[PDB]
Amino acid sequence: IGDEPLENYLDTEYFGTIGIGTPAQDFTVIFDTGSSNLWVPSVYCSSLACSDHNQFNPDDSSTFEATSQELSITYGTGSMTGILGYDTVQVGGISDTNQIFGLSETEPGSFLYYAPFDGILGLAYPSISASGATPVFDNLWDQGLVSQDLFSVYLSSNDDSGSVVLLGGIDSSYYTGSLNWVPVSVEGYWQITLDSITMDGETIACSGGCQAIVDTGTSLLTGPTSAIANIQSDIGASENSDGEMVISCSSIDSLPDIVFTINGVQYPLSPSAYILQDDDSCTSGFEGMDVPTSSGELWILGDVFIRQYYTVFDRANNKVGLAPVA
Amino acid sequence: IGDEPLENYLDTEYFGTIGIGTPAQDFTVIFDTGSSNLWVPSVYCSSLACSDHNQFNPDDSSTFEATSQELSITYGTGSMTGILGYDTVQVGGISDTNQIFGLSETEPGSFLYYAPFDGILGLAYPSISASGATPVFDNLWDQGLVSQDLFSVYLSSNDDSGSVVLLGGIDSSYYTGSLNWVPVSVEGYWQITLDSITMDGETIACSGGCQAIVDTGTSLLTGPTSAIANIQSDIGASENSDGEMVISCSSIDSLPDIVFTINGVQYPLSPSAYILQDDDSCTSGFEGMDVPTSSGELWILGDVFIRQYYTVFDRANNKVGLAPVA
Ligand SMILES: CCOC(=O)N[C@@H](CC(C)C)C(=O)N[C@@H](CC(C)C)C(=O)N[C@@H](CC1CCCCC1)[C@@H](O)[C@@H](O)CC(C)C
Ligand SMILES: CCOC(=O)N[C@@H](CC(C)C)C(=O)N[C@@H](CC(C)C)C(=O)N[C@@H](CC1CCCCC1)[C@@H](O)[C@@H](O)CC(C)C
Description:
2 copies of one chain form a homodimer. By secondary structure, the first copy, chain A, is mainly beta.
């Protein structure tokens, strides 16, 4: 079981440290369950986002193996094109040997240039892995490096220390009562079926269910624009400049829980979970984002939700396990 | 003995993580031996750099005690003014109970905005601490949270993992041979007497001594403008724009050791250590700054130097211990 400590930056991005190579070059990465690929900046990248960011030099690793397999990936925020090579990756105190990972050649856009992390470590299923590159957890299970075929995430609140990715195990100290398991409906993302979303008993969205992914890599709780636009009204948040659906911080103590019913069990987010507040200003935890898939237009249950529910991702049986954090 | 790992960001910045408060809030701080104050942003800070960095909120800490004292600190690059407060800083494993530190109120200048860290933990002598704020090492020793009255720094080269600050102990495995102990000359900074800087038999600089400090929070080897000017010429580096006193990377195999004799022992610097090379670009490790003190113009032996020499800063007997990295 590996323990990968995570830095909670503004409750928006949780990232940890990995080493790639021999000797090991260090990089901080986002641990993303919305994707399956590991990749970091390389000395071959010309994009501006690579200049101010730690870059992987293959000519300094006695263990590196090159391949000619090119790679291309687009996220909701940012993309990269690169090439796939091979090496040891130290992640969560484990020596992942012979891991295929992406070395970037371009990271188009201004977004990532600003970001306090170098790369992305995907944790979704191999089916969505661009260029078929073996996911890290997959390569660990395959090598017998993790004791169990599950990892779990605890994401801290209020910029506190202690967020963790526990690879190969759960730790009951992080949750209250017991885990509820939900089947993955469609296996690629950790896609689970959302039964409904209510406030004060009335369905306000997702009537007759909708598809949801549990994404550690999304900050907010994102959903199909039109739906979210309602919720925003149902809590009185309004637009400021570029996505700032601003809400008065006085409102927090008046609003009601918004309940997510997944597999018959209700998972409420209180107003103090779904309103993010910096110092003296509040914002909405909900973001509109149409993400069309073959299995429907997704509802992404980001850090805003994961912050309240210790999440376990069982690959052995394709189930998500949720329980309230301690 | 505290073990504090630092992320080597581009061989220019080495920062680690601390927690302030119960429950503890995360912050990444530069461990700077060139000052003595610990500060972090706080929710009082209005400044630009304070918006995109984590901010200490006293209201979410059950162990916070506030003070009336004001704090102002000008650094070589940057500054702050703030208010002082007390709380439990968990640094390197240790829970430094009831520690005074600065909650900033302004952090003027866009460079701090763009920087991948929140605060600075100063590691020098109390004489130079702003407002006579107890430096953390001092507060650990007074409470007996460290065994030995010394700390050691190992700074990895090449963006590798493994840079570490070892609080209250030296670790033999990081150096070659045995420590050479230099006395501190004047006690404020970790100030020592540099006897000469020669290059192929000839004194290129600082004949008949000059004052130097070993300063982990300074990226390059710094010295008085006019002196460094000659060294830049003698190695070939020339300005491009906002410095970028750039050198043809081809020159790394022609150039010789510049040598720093400290208390009669010679400490050479290979081209490989004094020309910085990100990617396929080599720039010069020397920077020209006139740093007037009551004990002369200071030479700063920063990161460029410390990456080649494991350094013990011993407060028990006012002495610095150097030995080559193994
Ligand atoms: C206040 C707004 O917050 C953000 O923009 N946050 C970023 C991530 C932050 C950790 C830097 C985000 O949520 N981006 C989403 C965009 C989403 C709302 C459409 C995203 O692309 N997340 C990536 C992961 C991110 C990519 C940017 C770098 C960090 C990892 C991945 O999970 C998805 O592409 C999965 C797909 C099913 C939607
Ligand atoms: C390649 C260019 O690199 C830098 O300019 N690096 C910065 C530090 C980096 C961590 C941003 C530097 O060397 N800053 C020196 C600049 C000075 C040599 C012209 C400095 O102010 N360092 C601070 C600590 C820094 C200050 C900015 C915040 C990070 C800690 C401290 O050591 C001095 O105040 C000591 C004094 C005797 C000069």
